[PDB]
Amino acid sequence: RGADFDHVYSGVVNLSTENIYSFNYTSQPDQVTAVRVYVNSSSENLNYPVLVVVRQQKEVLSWQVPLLFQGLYQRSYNYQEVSRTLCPSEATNETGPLQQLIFVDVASMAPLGAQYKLLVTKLKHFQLRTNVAFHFTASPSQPQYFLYKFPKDVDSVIIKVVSEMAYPCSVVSVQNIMCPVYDLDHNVEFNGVYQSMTKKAAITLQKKDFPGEQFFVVFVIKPEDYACGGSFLQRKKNLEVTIVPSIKESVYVKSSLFSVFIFLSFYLGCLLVGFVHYLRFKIYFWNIITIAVFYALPVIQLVITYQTVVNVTGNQDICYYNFLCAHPLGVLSAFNNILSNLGHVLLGFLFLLIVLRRDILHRRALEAHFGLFYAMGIALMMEGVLSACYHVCPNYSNFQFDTSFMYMIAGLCMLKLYQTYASFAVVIMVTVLGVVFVWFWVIFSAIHVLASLALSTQIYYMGDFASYMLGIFICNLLLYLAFYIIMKLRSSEKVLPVPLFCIVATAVMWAAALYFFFQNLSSWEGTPAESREKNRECILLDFFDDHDIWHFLSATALFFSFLVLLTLDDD
Amino acid sequence: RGADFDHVYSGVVNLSTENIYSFNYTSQPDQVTAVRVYVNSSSENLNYPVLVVVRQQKEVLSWQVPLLFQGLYQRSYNYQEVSRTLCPSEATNETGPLQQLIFVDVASMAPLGAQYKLLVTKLKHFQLRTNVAFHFTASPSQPQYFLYKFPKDVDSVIIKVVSEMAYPCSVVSVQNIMCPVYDLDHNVEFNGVYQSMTKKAAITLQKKDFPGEQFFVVFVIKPEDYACGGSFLQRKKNLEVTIVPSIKESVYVKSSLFSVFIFLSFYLGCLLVGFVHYLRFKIYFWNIITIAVFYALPVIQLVITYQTVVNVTGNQDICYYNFLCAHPLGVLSAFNNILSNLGHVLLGFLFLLIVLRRDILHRRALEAHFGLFYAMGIALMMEGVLSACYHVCPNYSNFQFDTSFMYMIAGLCMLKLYQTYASFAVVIMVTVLGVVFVWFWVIFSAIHVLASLALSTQIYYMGDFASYMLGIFICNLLLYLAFYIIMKLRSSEKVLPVPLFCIVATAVMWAAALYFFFQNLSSWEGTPAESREKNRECILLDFFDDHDIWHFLSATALFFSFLVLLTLDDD
Ligand SMILES: *[C@@H]1O[C@H](CO)[C@@H](O[C@@H]2O[C@H](CO)[C@@H](O[C@@H]3O[C@H](CO)[C@@H](O)[C@H](O)[C@@H]3O)[C@H](O)[C@H]2NC(C)=O)[C@H](O)[C@H]1NC(C)=O
Ligand SMILES: *[C@@H]1O[C@H](CO)[C@@H](O[C@@H]2O[C@H](CO)[C@@H](O[C@@H]3O[C@H](CO)[C@@H](O)[C@H](O)[C@@H]3O)[C@H](O)[C@H]2NC(C)=O)[C@H](O)[C@H]1NC(C)=O
Ligand SMILES: *[C@@H]1O[C@H](CO)[C@@H](O[C@@H]2O[C@H](CO)[C@@H](O[C@@H]3O[C@H](CO)[C@@H](O)[C@H](O)[C@@H]3O)[C@H](O)[C@H]2NC(C)=O)[C@H](O)[C@H]1NC(C)=O
Ligand SMILES: *[C@@H]1O[C@H](CO)[C@@H](O[C@@H]2O[C@H](CO)[C@@H](O[C@@H]3O[C@H](CO)[C@@H](O)[C@H](O)[C@@H]3O)[C@H](O)[C@H]2NC(C)=O)[C@H](O)[C@H]1NC(C)=O
Ligand SMILES: *[C@@H]1O[C@H](CO)[C@@H](O[C@@H]2O[C@H](CO)[C@@H](O)[C@H](O)[C@H]2NC(C)=O)[C@H](O)[C@H]1NC(C)=O
Ligand SMILES: *[C@@H]1O[C@H](CO)[C@@H](O[C@@H]2O[C@H](CO)[C@@H](O)[C@H](O)[C@H]2NC(C)=O)[C@H](O)[C@H]1NC(C)=O
Ligand SMILES: *[C@@H]1O[C@H](CO)[C@@H](O[C@@H]2O[C@H](CO)[C@@H](O)[C@H](O)[C@H]2NC(C)=O)[C@H](O)[C@H]1NC(C)=O
Ligand SMILES: *[C@@H]1O[C@H](CO)[C@@H](O[C@@H]2O[C@H](CO)[C@@H](O)[C@H](O)[C@H]2NC(C)=O)[C@H](O)[C@H]1NC(C)=O
Ligand SMILES: [Zn+2]
Ligand SMILES: [Zn+2]
């Protein structure tokens, strides 16, 4: 039967009859066209569904209406409206216009008869445009996919998908041109890069991965929200896809020089105040760096295999990146998260150089206190190193390594103190019970405030859970630095200007750094799709987000606070 | 057109014609029947394939002949013979016999005509039997699957699949009864437990996971061997599946008592030789166990998430178990690999008790050497602990943690020695270059023999890469123990019988343990399917394989060698 596009054909089919519709159209040698088939079925006899077969020249598609989805815990769903977009065949200049035939066979084995409505339309918005937002609606029975063609100048693009509602849970996938196109829930993650989303998604692609310099962007809606962060007629989802070009290679070399020349200006400070003085005229140390080298050896090998699993598969749900500001460089998918830790490592070498100069000049004056300062600058290096391997592929498992090492350092430091205790030990053991799981949480914060009071009093007599350590790192040291400002003012002592600049710089840097610490852009505490809802763009030279600025400012704030403790003893 | 089973129908189809065959049969209320459809296509015009649609009452299947597979690096394959087994509908006593209809629509859009051969048979060997080997042949275009029904007494089964040839690479999957059955390469790993095999495979199932107490065993042949350990008309594979019942709960409690009462008999030895004597009438220590606790904290959390990823998915290719002797217990998939390390931990507590008794009696005699012996017994505990967390889910990543810690211990021990060197340092750095990659390998073994000679000479003056450390652990200590046997014999010294029994027990235990060490049953150095080829059955009470016996004997051999070093100084 000859049939026309954009016309709703209705009919009744049963065991003896079988309706066959023939659709005839042509494809232009430059324009690319796609055909979408809509089938309805008002008959709710689930034992006798409507079987629809779509035949092309090189492909056959088949589905049953109403669609059935087997949910978890013995749940089933029906979908009376099923839609599908056929795989387009692109005509070139070498072939000219191409005539194409589509046969749509609608049949059923019902004894009485099943009603159905068939509508076949052409898609006028199949091809996506650069920097143009496109709005569309998808459904678990009605998947959608579109085509993007790479321009000649553009070498890498970012696909930004944004939705205003969290549910239903969706899947965005990028696939090749060659038919078939896997747009069903059981084969969408078979090949190509894919992501899971609730509100936001971001996929970064390169031109060299696709031989035709084009790809399909497949949008599949899941029938249940168990894979995302949730549970449980139609689950219609409104989406908005925008494809933007990535930054050029000049932004890479401009931001790399900013991350070096800022912290090399700190090296100019020591060589400038060392010129003022010209114008004014071990085994236990080596023991703490073999532990750090042998601790850091498996965690580099752990996250390298995490990165290569992501690269050779399409599973971008393993690493918890900030995908809106993840700029790749070769194997690394987020080079900006590694580059901002370079200044954190380097600045510790300046502090180790400063305490070396103080130790040699004290030993030279001895011819005519400095031990833990070496370990304080060593921990500045290794945490910047461990943050770099954490940011190769951030995950729930990798966070239990870069913080546990620092906890171990604190433990060994207490042993040295004891050489010249239980309330701090329950604190380490209460927080691992919260990993397992009203009575627990009222003492979870009660012992943390008591231990914060039990750190400040012992220093006074000597005169996530990592954020809770960082909570007391700001709170107790603010009073601990302020204890000798009022003690030296009351006694016969004066504050030199060189500590005075370092005290006021430590206060303003920790005020600025703690603001950027609370701007969480990702979280492994929930599902990977829930982590993507908090992603944000780059706010520094289109290369650094809020968390990468925190890596810069906490490097300065740790350095200036450590320089305060080296000073204030010149009287 | 009415058609009969077991008859090869041939025909020519083109654009105008479309052959439709109707197949009519009945299903018995106790016997379960399955229908297999074979389609050939001798026409090699790839632009106009033969499109076959199989319609049932509740399901529609469609495929094109010849089948096309898109390989890696732009490779394509054709398959002129395509076979498929339709999803069976089981008739019960409540429904009686059921009449069923199958329509097979064969069509093509070729202008001239395409030849095809259709054959539809019933399967007389669809249901599998317990403890009965079944032989069958599969192909990438001809997947096969069978049905197993759980007996009332059996609560858990093991599916043992064995093939005589490594290639082609195959996939074995276990799925639910409910249609559709995913037997294609793009959806076989969508749900249910699946495994990848080349020669052997073993899937362990429980009755409580399947609500119908039955399952489908799907066999899918991959078109390429890149997922397995290899590369690159038909790729026919001969397989053999046997379903065996698992061991009862009595074997669990019998083998658990064997692992305890053997090593508790070692505790009876100290309480027996302590009765003979009745008838004859710190801070640095605490520093080494906080490093071990903080090192062991993330690796338990690393492998627990590895186990839960395996459990909630079907991916059994992550953990490198010995699947022929992997006995689950709750969350753990291989409980026998955890249980054999219990005696390795416990036996170290006896050695720590022995050196405590020697230290107290020496201190009591002081009123009227023992430091590293505490650390030697501590490393006996922690390596048995670290082998247990390694065997929760063995992997390439987890091996770089349980060996690196021991390497770190050796490093810190050298610091104590230095307190009272470069050739040992290149050895640690050469072996990590072999992870990256003729000139390298001739010095890889040359520096290892030289360093083995450079360990023995320094002790003489005081009077995988983990297997290479274990290579010198046997070789250098054999001469190092033999150095004072000939020295005491030449000088005026006699060997007491209590060391003498311990020397001859150390030699026979290390001879027995090294035999079981070289029986490798798994290897993460290759693909997961290549690791499964070396799996073996349990050789000790149907609960312990060769590697679990190695955990028993090396625990005794380390204990008796450590007891030798405590003795031989009574003169
Ligand atoms: C496939 O064939 C078509 C048909 O010739 C090609 O389209 C043609 O492309 C050229 C190159 O850009 C166009 O010439 C340009 O025309 C504009 C005015 O439209 C003029 O301002 C430029 O200076 C230039 O001369 C040409 O107009 C265009 N033809 C049509 C009908 O639009 C197409 O490029 C071919 N594609 C491939 C991949 O070979
Ligand atoms: C299959 O059944 C569905 C659901 O009954 C049909 O979708 C419905 O289509 C009509 C006409 O396209 C929509 O009516 C229009 O709605 C808009 C927005 O409310 C309104 O501005 C218009 O004046 C008009 O009333 C209707 O909303 C829509 N229903 C839903 C739930 O989306 C569909 O057309 C049927 N046929 C096929 C081939 O899918
Ligand atoms: C579905 O209906 C069939 C038909 O009745 C049931 O098969 C029947 O099962 C009973 C129970 O085992 C059989 O009785 C046994 O017969 C053997 C001799 O064959 C005798 O030695 C035993 O002592 C016992 O009496 C009965 O023979 C068998 N009928 C036939 C025709 O084989 C079947 O159990 C029903 N299934 C369900 C799930 O209800
Ligand atoms: C589609 O084409 C294939 C391949 O041409 C056909 O398979 C062939 O089937 C014949 C008859 O079943 C087999 O011949 C028999 O071979 C055995 C073992 O060599 C021999 O003992 C017998 O005397 C007989 O000659 C033939 O081996 C087999 N070819 C292959 C490669 O397996 C198939 O029958 C065709 N039709 C369908 C519906 O699949
Ligand atoms: C449903 O099946 C019935 C028979 O099972 C068929 O009804 C026929 O409809 C055609 C025209 O639509 C006429 O020949 C008669 O009204 C019916 N013939 C017979 C022999 O029953 C038909 O296949 C289906 N009915 C529909 C679509 O209305
Ligand atoms: C699809 O429609 C086109 C018309 O748009 C048909 O093309 C016609 O074909 C006949 C015979 O081949 C010619 O005599 C006409 O001149 C063609 N029309 C045009 C506008 O070129 C085409 O045949 C149709 N497809 C099928 C399968 O019938
Ligand atoms: C291939 O297509 C041709 C037409 O394109 C058809 O050949 C017809 O075959 C039938 C019987 O097989 C007879 O009516 C004539 O021999 C042909 N008729 C016409 C109008 O050409 C047929 O569809 C196919 N040929 C086969 C299967 O042999
Ligand atoms: C499939 O075959 C069976 C026979 O094995 C057909 O059953 C017959 O149905 C007619 C009318 O319904 C009865 O008069 C006969 O007595 C039945 N035969 C038997 C042996 O019971 C059945 O109709 C066939 N299916 C179809 C769709 O025609
Ligand atoms: Zn960070
Ligand atoms: Zn082991």
Author numbering:
A (entry chain C), B (entry chain A): 44 to 275, 287 to 335, 442 to 528, 541 to 592, 605 to 621, 626 to 651, 708 to 815
Can you list sentences taken from the study reporting this PDB entry?
Although clear densities corresponding to dsRNA were not observed, the cryo-EM structures of hSIDT1 in the presence of 25 bp dsRNA at pH5.0 were interestingly converged to 2 classes; one class is essentially same as the structure in the absence of dsRNA and similarly binds to cholesterol, while the other class has different conformation of the transmembrane (TM) region with no cholesterol binding. In the cholesterol-unbound form, TM5 rotates about 25° and its cytoplasmic side greatly moves from inside the membrane spanning region to the dimer interface (14 Å shift of the Cα atom of Thr592), which resulted in the interaction with TM2 of the other protomer. TM6 which interacts with TM2 in the cholesterol-bound form is pushed out (15.6 Å shift of the Cα atom of Tyr605) by the TM5 rotational motion and its N-terminal region is partially disordered. Of note, despite the transmembrane region undergoes a large conformational change, the homodimer is maintained in the cholesterol-unbound form by the alternative interface in which TM5 displaces TM6 in the cholesterol-bound form. In the cholesterol-unbound form, no lipid-like density was observed between TM5 and TM6, which suggests that cholesterol stabilize the cholesterol-bound form structure through binding to the concave between TM5 and TM6. Interestingly, a tunnel is found to be formed in the transmembrane region in the cholesterol-unbound form structure by the conformational change in the transmembrane region. This tunnel is surrounded by TM4, TM5, TM9, TM10, and TM11 and penetrates the transmembrane region by passing through beside the zinc ion. TM8 is supposed to be located outside TM7 according to the weak density although TM8 is disordered in the cryo-EM map of the cholesterol-unbound form, which strongly indicates that TM8 do not intercept the tunnel.
Two mammalian homologs of systemic RNA interference defective protein 1 (SID-1) (SIDT1/2) are suggested to function as double-stranded RNA (dsRNA) transporters for extracellular dsRNA uptake or for release of incorporated dsRNA from lysosome to cytoplasm. Here, we determine the cryo-electron microscopy structures of human SIDT1, homodimer in a side-by-side arrangement, with two distinct conformations, the cholesterol-bound form and the unbound form. Our structures reveal that the membrane-spanning region of SIDT1 harbors conserved histidine and aspartate residues coordinating to putative zinc ion, in a structurally similar manner to alkaline ceramidases or adiponectin receptors that require zinc for ceramidase activity. We identify that SIDT1 has a ceramidase activity that is attenuated by cholesterol binding.
